[PDB]
Write an enzyme that holds these catalytic residues in place. Structure first.
Site, PDB file in Angstrom:
ATOM      1  CG  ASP A  59      -2.176   1.121   1.024  1.00  0.00           C
ATOM      2  OD1 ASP A  59      -2.339   1.398  -0.193  1.00  0.00           O
ATOM      3  OD2 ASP A  59      -2.833   1.152   1.988  1.00  0.00           O
TER       4      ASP A  59
ATOM      5  N   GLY B 191      -9.273   8.735   7.090  1.00  0.00           N
ATOM      6  CA  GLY B 191      -8.717  10.055   6.468  1.00  0.00           C
ATOM      7  C   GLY B 191      -7.109  10.435   6.816  1.00  0.00           C
TER       8      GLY B 191
ATOM      9  CB  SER C 137      -5.291   6.286   4.263  1.00  0.00           C
ATOM     10  OG  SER C 137      -6.104   5.449   5.167  1.00  0.00           O
TER      11      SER C 137
END
Ligand SMILES: Cn1cc(-c2nc(C(=O)NC(=N)N)c(N)nc2N)cn1
Length: 245
Positions: A97, A196, A198
């Site tokens: 990610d 939020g 992330s």
């Protein structure tokens, strides 16, 4: 950020605020990121995967508030949106990610460092702090899991690194957590990253240097007992970062 404290961009001058244009022209907040060089912001792939078009995004540096301008801020278009080829999403876990945004202004310039805008150092490869080390996280994410709004003022808090072994326990996340992820949490589960946050930085002091150790990636809930925050382990992606920058 659940708990912690309000702050301003001077205390995290590499923090990038990333927004998306709609669809008729409203702009909404997407995710955080970190400035690793004048032209490059690093973030999480899951932030962009549903709308993978670079022209949809705006990046601010030197910004301390969500929906009002900060004096000295800079605004950028995304010249390049690079998502990780091996990205996958589980129900909870996101693998690989990590994402890179090449930033350029309308005047075709990259970031000029200032009091409110600086770069953050990457770690040396496979070199992270030991478990129990206190690190900081920063973002505009929710202050409570039940909140509808995001805070208008930037926040930060402290969490402690959790060992892969502890985070691997079924009670925690089982095998959802890999060696390319880092867990971190409060001993009282009192403060945490949330929706939020992330893409934003997990910063640790290593060798007397502030180091981008992690990128906010996922969690089950926020500030829930036995459910730490999960972070992309930046020291396991240096070749990918090297190659793509
Ligand atoms: C419903 N929900 C969404 C989340 C969420 N959580 C996190 C998160 O970081 N959670 C945590 N550290 N416990 C995140 N980065 N992004 C999210 N969208 C948690 N619960």
């Amino acid at each position: 950020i659940i708990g912690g404290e309000f702050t301003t961009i001077e205390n995290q001058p590499w923090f990038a605020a990333i927004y998306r244009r709609h669809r008729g022209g409203s702009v909404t907040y997407v995710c955080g990121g970190s400035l690793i060089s004048p032209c490059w912001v690093i973030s999480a792939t899951h932030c962009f995967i549903d709308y993978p078009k670079k022209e949809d995004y705006i990046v601010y540096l030197g910004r301390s508030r969500l929906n009002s301008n900060t004096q000295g801020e800079m605004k950028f278009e995304v010249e390049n949106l690079i998502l990780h080829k091996d990205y996958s999403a589980d129900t909870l876990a996101h693998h690989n990610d990590i994402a890179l945004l090449k930033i350029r202004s309308k005047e075709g310039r990259c970031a000029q460092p200032s009091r409110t805008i600086q770069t953050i150092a990457l770690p040396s490869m496979y070199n992270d702090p030991q478990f129990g080390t206190s690190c900081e996280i920063t973002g505009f994410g929710k202050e409570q899991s039940t909140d509808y709004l995001y805070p208008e003022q930037l926040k930060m808090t402290v969490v402690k690194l959790i060992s892969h072994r502890e985070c691997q326990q079924p009670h925690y996340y089982g095998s959802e957590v890999t060696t390319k992820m880092l867990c971190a949490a409060d001993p009282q589960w009192k403060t945490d990253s949330c929706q939020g946050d992330s893409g934003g930085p997990l910063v640790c002091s290593l060798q007397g240097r502030m180091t981008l150790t992690g990128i906010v990636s996922w969690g089950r809930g926020c500030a829930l007992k036995d459910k730490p925050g999960v972070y992309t382990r930046v020291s396991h992606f240096l070749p990918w970062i090297r190659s793509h920058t």
